[PDB]
C-alpha cells in the first residue's frame, strides 16, 4: 500500500497517542502535533477528504503516502549522516548503525571511513 | 469506507453517585466508613520525609548511613525538586540535597561519578536507580523512622501498612507513573517480588492500586448512534423457517442446528426456563447491529445472519426433537425462539481437540481481537464463560479488603464447558452490557462488587474514639468504575487461558510423548502471552511487538508453561507428598511451592466434589501464579500506559505556552520543561521523543544564547538514534 509495516506501526501509535478520547478519529487542531512528531511539518494540510469531518486511521495512512511518496529521501538522507558525522566528510562508528540502535542483520563497507550516498 | 467508534472516553468528577450508604453494620450498631484521602496522605508523609532529611544532615550521621542509600536520598531530592513547579519550594529541595551530594562528593567519590551519569541523562534520575532491586530497599521509611521521632497520625499508619513494600510508592503523580511504565523497559530487572526473613512477598497488585488511586474517575458517553441509545423500531420476522426432523444436524443446549444444501447451518434458539422475550429481541438486534458495523469497527468473526425472531409452539419443538440424545426450555405451550443462520465454525468451541495448533491461534487471535475492539466500541461481555454472589474476580486484591491472591476456580473445565468463544470467533452476543454500566451502580456493580461501592470495613480500620471505620479502600467508591475496567479486561484474558487450558488438557491425554505435550503447552503459554500483548496494542496502540516484550520483563513464559502443564492435567494426582514436592520445586523455581492440605483424588487431582479438577485447595488461592502476574503486568501496562499520556500531555502544554510567550519565564526553566517532557515519553516509542527533541531545537532558537550543557548529552541522543532510523529504513534491499 506504498506503505511498508514499519511505518504504519509508528502512525498507528502515533495517531493513537493523540486521539485522546479514544475516538478513532483526531481533530484537525492535532494532527499539527502528530505531523510534528512524524518528521513533516507543513503549513496547510487542506482538501482532504472531508466525508468525516475528522480523518479516521483509514484516511490518515493513506494521506502519508501522498506526503513520503513525494519527500525526497537524499535529503532526509544526508542530513542523517552529516548528524553522525563531527568533523566534514567512519566504518568503525557506522558499525553502531545497529550494534546499538535497531535492525542488525548481515550489515555491508566500502571502508578503504564513508563519504557520501550511495542508492542502489 | 470509515472506520472508528461509537464512543468516547472523557473524565468525570465522581463515581459516587447514588450507591450505598457507606455504613457497615456489625453487631447491631452500624460503623460510618469513612475515607482516608491518597494524595493528602503521601505528600504529608513526604514533608514529614523532608523534615527528616533535615534532621539527618544535622546529626551529621551521614557516614553512618551505606552509600547506596544516600544515593537513593540525594537522586530522589533531585529528582523532586524537577518535578516541583515554583522556584521557591524547588530550593528547598535543593538546598536538602546540596549537603548530601558534597558528602558524597567528598568521602563517596565513586557513587558520585554513577549518579551524576544519571542526572545527565534524565530529570527523574530516581527512576532509572531503581530499575532494579534497589526498588525494594524503602528507603524514605527507613529515614522516617529513623529520625522523625514522633508516632506518625493514623492516616499516615494505614497508608505506610498499605505501602510498605517501596518507597516509589510515596513518589508524587508524574514521577511515579514514569517509573512504573520504564519498569518494563528492556534494561530494567525490577519484578514486584522480594524475599524477607525467607518469606516471599509479591506486592504487583499493590503497582496497579497505588496507580489507580492517583487516576481520575473515567466516564464514557456512546452517541446517540450507538447499539444502546439508537431507538429502532421493532424486528421484521416476516419468514419463517420450516424445521424438519432429517435436516437436523445437533441438538447444542437449548439451540436446534440444521442442515442446509450450502453446508451451513440454520440454528433456531429456544426460550431459556426463566428468560424473557426480550433477551432474545436483544441477540437479534444485536447481531444486526454488528453485521452493519463489521466494516467499522474490522470485526473478524463471521457473525451470524439473524433470519427471525418469533413464537412457537411447544408442541411443535418436542415434535421435531425426539430423535436426538435430549428440560432447559420454558412451561408450555408457546416459547419464543430466535432463528439465525451460521457457519459450522460458529458451533465448534474453542478448546475443541479437532483443532490443529494452527487454526487454534488464528481463531483465537479472532476472538481476542473483536473482544477488545468491541470493549472500545462500549460493548462488555460479563458471561463469557460460567466461572462461579460467587462470581469470580480476576483482580481480587483491588476489589476487596483482607483478600491477597486468585482464589480457587471450581471445575475449572467446566467453567469454560459451553464458552462464548468459537472457532468462528465470538458467538451468543445477546447477553452484552453497556460500558457504562461498569462506571455506574447498576444492578450488575451493586450485586456483584457491593464491597467497592460501599466502602470496606476491617477490625484494625475501626477507631474507638470517632466510632468511625478509615480506610484507603473506601477511597475507591469515587473511583471505583476505573477498578471494574481494569478487572474486565483481566477477566477476558482468564477466559482465554481456561479455554487454552480446556484444549491442553484434551489434546495431551491419551497421548504418550512427554516432549510432543511440553511442545503444545510451550505453544500454548505463547498463544497467551501474545493474546495479552494484542490487547495492550489495541487498548494503547502500542506495538504488539513490544508489547510482547515489556510483557516478558514482568512475568515469566517459562514458569507460566510449566505451571499450566502442571496444574491443568490429572498427572500430579498420581503422586506422592515427596515427587510432587520436588517438582512443585520445578515450576516456580525461586518462589514458595504451593501448600495444600488437601487429599488428592486420583485421576483427577485437588477436587472439592471428587470428579471435576479444581484449580486450587478447598479455601487456598490459586497455583497459577505467573497467571496472575500476566494479568496483573497487562492491566499496569494498559493503565500505566493511559496515565503515562496523560501526565505527557499535561507537560506538553506547558512547554508550548513557555514557547508561545504565553508564560513569560526565562531560559533555564524553558529547558527544564523540555527535558522533563522527554521523561513522560513511552518506553521505547521514538516519534515521541523525535517530537520532544523538535521542541528542544526551537527553545534553543527562542534563546540563543543561552547555555545548553545540562541537556546537549540526552538530546543528543535522540538525535543519533532518529538519524539511525532513516538509515535503516532504507533496507530496501535485502
Ligand atoms: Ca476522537
Known amino acids: ?120 | 469506507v470509515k472506520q472508528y467508534y461509537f464512543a468516547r472516553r472523557g473524565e468525570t468528577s465522581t463515581h459516587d453517585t447514588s450507591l450505598p450508604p457507606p455504613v457497615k453494620v456489625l453487631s447491631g450498631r452500624s460503623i460510618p466508613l469513612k475515607e482516608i484521602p491518597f494524595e493528602a496522605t503521601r505528600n504529608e508523609l513526604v514533608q514529614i520525609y523532608l523534615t527528616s532529611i533535615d534532621k539527618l544532615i544535622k546529626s551529621n550521621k551521614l557516614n553512618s548511613i551505606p552509600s547506596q542509600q544516600i544515593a537513593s536520598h540525594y537522586l530522589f531530592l533531585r529528582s523532586l525538586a524537577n518535578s516541583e513547579t515554583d522556584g521557591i519550594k524547588k530550593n528547598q529541595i535543593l538546598s536538602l540535597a546540596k549537603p548530601l551530594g558534597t558528602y558524597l562528593a567528598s568521602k563517596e567519590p565513586h557513587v558520585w561519578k554513577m549518579i551524576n551519569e544519571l542526572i545527565e541523562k534524565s530529570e527523574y534520575p530516581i527512576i532509572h536507580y531503581l530499575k532494579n532491586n534497589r526498588a525494594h530497599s524503602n528507603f524514605m521509611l527507613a529515614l522516617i523512622h529513623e529520625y522523625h521521632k514522633e508516632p506518625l497520625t493514623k492516616n499516615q499508619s494505614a497508608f505506610v501498612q498499605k505501602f510498605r513494600d517501596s518507597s516509589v510508592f510515596l513518589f508524587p503523580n508524574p514521577i511515579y507513573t514514569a517509573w512504573l511504565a520504564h519498569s518494563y523497559d528492556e534494561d530494567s530487572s525490577f519484578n514486584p517480588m522480594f524475599r524477607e526473613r525467607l518469606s516471599t512477598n509479591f506486592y504487583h497488585s499493590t503497582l496497579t492500586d497505588n496507580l489507580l488511586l492517583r487516576t481520575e474517575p473515567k466516564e464514557v458517553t456512546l452517541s446517540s448512534e450507538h447499539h444502546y441509545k439508537k431507538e429502532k423500531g421493532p424486528i421484521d420476522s416476516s419468514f419463517r423457517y420450516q424445521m424438519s426432523s432429517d435436516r437436523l444436524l445437533r441438538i447444542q443446549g437449548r439451540t436446534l442446528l440444521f442442515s442446509t444444501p450450502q453446508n451451513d447451518v440454520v440454528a433456531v434458539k429456544v426460550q431459556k426456563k426463566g428468560e424473557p422475550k426480550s433477551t432474545l429481541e436483544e441477540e437479534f438486534e444485536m447481531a444486526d447491529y454488528l453485521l452493519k458495523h463489521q466494516r467499522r469497527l474490522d470485526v473478524h468473526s463471521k457473525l451470524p445472519q439473524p433470519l427471525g425472531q418469533y413464537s412457537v409452539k411447544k408442541s411443535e419443538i418436542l415434535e421435531i426433537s425426539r430423535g436426538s440424545l435430549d428440560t432447559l426450555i420454558d412451561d408450555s405451550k408457546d416459547l419464543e425462539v430466535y432463528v439465525y443462520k451460521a457457519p459450522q465454525s460458529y458451533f465448534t468451541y474453542l478448546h475443541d481437540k479437532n483443532q490443529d495448533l494452527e487454526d487454534l491461534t488464528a481463531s483465537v487471535k479472532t476472538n481476542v481481537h473483536d473482544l477488545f475492539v468491541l470493549l472500545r466500541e462500549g460493548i462488555v461481555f460479563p458471561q463469557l464463560a460460567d466461572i462461579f454472589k460467587g462470581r469470580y474476580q480476576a483482580l481480587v486484591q483491588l476489589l476487596n479488603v483482607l483478600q491477597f491472591q486468585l482464589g480457587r476456580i471450581d471445575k475449572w473445565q467446566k467453567a469454560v464447558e459451553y464458552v462464548n468463544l468459537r472457532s468462528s470467533g465470538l458467538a451468543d452476543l445477546g447477553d452484552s452490557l453497556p460500558i457504562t454500566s461498569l462506571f455506574t451502580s447498576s444492578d450488575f456493580t451493586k450485586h456483584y462488587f457491593s464491597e467497592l461501592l460501599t466502602g470496606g470495613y476491617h477490625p484494625t480500620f475501626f477507631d474507638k474514639s470517632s466510632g468511625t471505620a478509615n480506610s484507603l479502600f473506601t477511597g475507591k467508591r469515587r473511583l471505583f468504575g476505573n477498578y471494574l475496567y481494569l478487572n474486565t479486561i483481566a477477566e477476558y484474558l482468564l477466559v482465554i487461558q481456561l479455554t487454552l487450558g480446556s484444549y491442553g488438557d484434551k489434546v495431551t491425554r491419551d497421548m504418550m510423548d512427554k516432549p510432543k505435550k511440553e511442545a503444545v503447552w510451550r505453544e500454548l503459554a505463547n498463544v497467551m502471552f501474545t493474546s495479552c500483548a494484542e490487547a495492550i496494542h489495541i487498548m494503547t496502540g502500542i506495538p504488539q511487538s513490544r508489547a510482547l516484550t515489556l510483557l516478558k520483563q514482568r512475568a515469566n513464559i517459562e514458569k507460566h508453561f510449566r505451571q499450566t502443564q502442571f496444574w491443568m492435567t490429572p498427572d500430579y494426582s498420581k503422586l506422592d507428598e515427596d515427587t510432587l514436592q520436588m517438582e512443585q520445586y520445578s515450576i516456580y523455581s525461586g518462589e514458595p511451592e504451593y501448600e495444600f492440605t488437601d487429599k488428592l483424588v486420583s485421576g483427577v487431582g485437588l477436587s472439592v466434589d471428587g470428579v471435576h479438577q479444581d484449580l486450587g485447595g478447598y479455601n487456598r488461592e490459586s497455583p497459577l501464579r505467573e497467571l496472575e502476574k500476566l494479568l496483573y503486568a497487562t492491566v499496569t501496562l494498559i493503565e500505566g500506559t493511559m496515565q503515562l499520556d496523560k501526565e505527557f500531555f499535561k507537560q506538553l502544554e506547558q512547554v508550548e505556552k513557555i514557547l508561545s510567550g504565553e508564560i513569560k519565564t526565562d531560559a533555564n526553566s524553558c529547558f527544564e520543561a523540555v527535558a522533563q517532557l522527554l521523561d513522560l515519553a513511552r518506553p521505547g516509542c521514538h516519534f515521541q521523543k523525535r517530537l520532544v527533541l523538535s521542541y528542544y531545537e526551537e527553545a534553543k532558537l527562542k534563546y540563543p544564547s543561552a547555555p545548553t550543557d545540562a541537556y546537549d548529552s540526552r538530546f543528543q541522543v535522540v538525535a543519533r538514534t532518529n538519524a539511525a532510523i532513516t538509515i535503516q529504513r532504507f533496507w530496501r534491499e535485502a
Do not use: C, W
Not at chain 1, 493513537?16 to 481533530?27: Q, V
Open chain 1, 1 to 120: 500500500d506504498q506503505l511498508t509495516e514499519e511505518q504504519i506501526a509508528e502512525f498507528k501509535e502515533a495517531f493513537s497517542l493523540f486521539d485522546k478520547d479514544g475516538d478513532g478519529t483526531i481533530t484537525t487542531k492535532e494532527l499539527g502535533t502528530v505531523m510534528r512528531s512524524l518528521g513533516q511539518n507543513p503549513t496547510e494540510a487542506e482538501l482532504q477528504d472531508m466525508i468525516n469531518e475528522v480523518d479516521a486511521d483509514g484516511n490518515g495512512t493513506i494521506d502519508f503516502p501522498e506526503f513520503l511518496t513525494m519527500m525526497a529521501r537524499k535529503m532526509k538522507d544526508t542530513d542523517s549522516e552529516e548528524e553522525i558525522r563531527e568533523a566534514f566528510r567512519d566504518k568503525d562508528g557506522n558499525g553502531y548503525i545497529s550494534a546499538a540502535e535497531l535492525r542488525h542483520v548481515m550489515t555491508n563497507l566500502g571502508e578503504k571511513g564513508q563519504v557520501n550516498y550511495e542508492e542502489f
